[PDB]
Amino acid sequence: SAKEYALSGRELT
Amino acid sequence: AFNKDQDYWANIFVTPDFLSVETYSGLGMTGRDPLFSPRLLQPDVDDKSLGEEILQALSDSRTLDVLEERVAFFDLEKSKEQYAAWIATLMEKYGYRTKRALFKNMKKVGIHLVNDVITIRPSFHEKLEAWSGNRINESDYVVLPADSSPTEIGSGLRLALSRCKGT
Ligand SMILES: [Cl-]
């Protein structure tokens, strides 16, 4: 929630 | 179909051995939505099949507008078990001996549909199990109208994949 970050089946958008 | 101002999320994880189209759901934070069976494709799947899969995965993407729904969706023990379960399946199905084998050449392309636009973001494979938008410039995004043919979406996914960075 922007650069995204994907980790552990999750993604910060 | 897709509602105005509603976000729909899908991620594609690609190894040399497979292509996995995954519905992500959430709100701000998103996560692989375990409601939906996986959508595993042959690494060389044709553009049209891929595009159709991506559009369907996008259509399954939920906005967790309900608080309790969000809290439950992102429960740490549950998230942890699901991700671990995720790894296990992939490893078992394609015969990866270790997690590293599974992840070491895994690319991730993020797909985001909001309003009239599908945005396909290459990612930087920063750690074994982490993909970041850092070091991917906005200009490397593949942007397509939402009404693109499944083939153009598939082709666009392939373009983004070619722009992922690693190691
Ligand atoms: Cl977030």
Hey, of B13, B30, B61, B90, which one would you mutate to test binding to chain A, going by the most A CBs within 10 A of its CB? Answer: B30
DSSP-assigned states of every residue in B94-121: HT-SSHHHHHHT-EEEEEEEETTEEEEE
Closest CB from A4, A8, A10 relative to B121: A4
Q: Do A5 and B79 touch (CB under 8 A)?
A: no
What topology is assigned to B1-167 in CATH? NMB0488-like fold (3.40.1590)
User: Which helix or strand (DSSP H or E) is residue B142 part of?
Assistant: strand B142-145
* B92 alpha carbon – ligand 1 mean position (Å): 30
Give B67: exposed, middle or buried? Use CB within 10 Å, 0-12, 13-18, 19+.
exposed
| Domain locations in chain B as residue ranges | 1-167
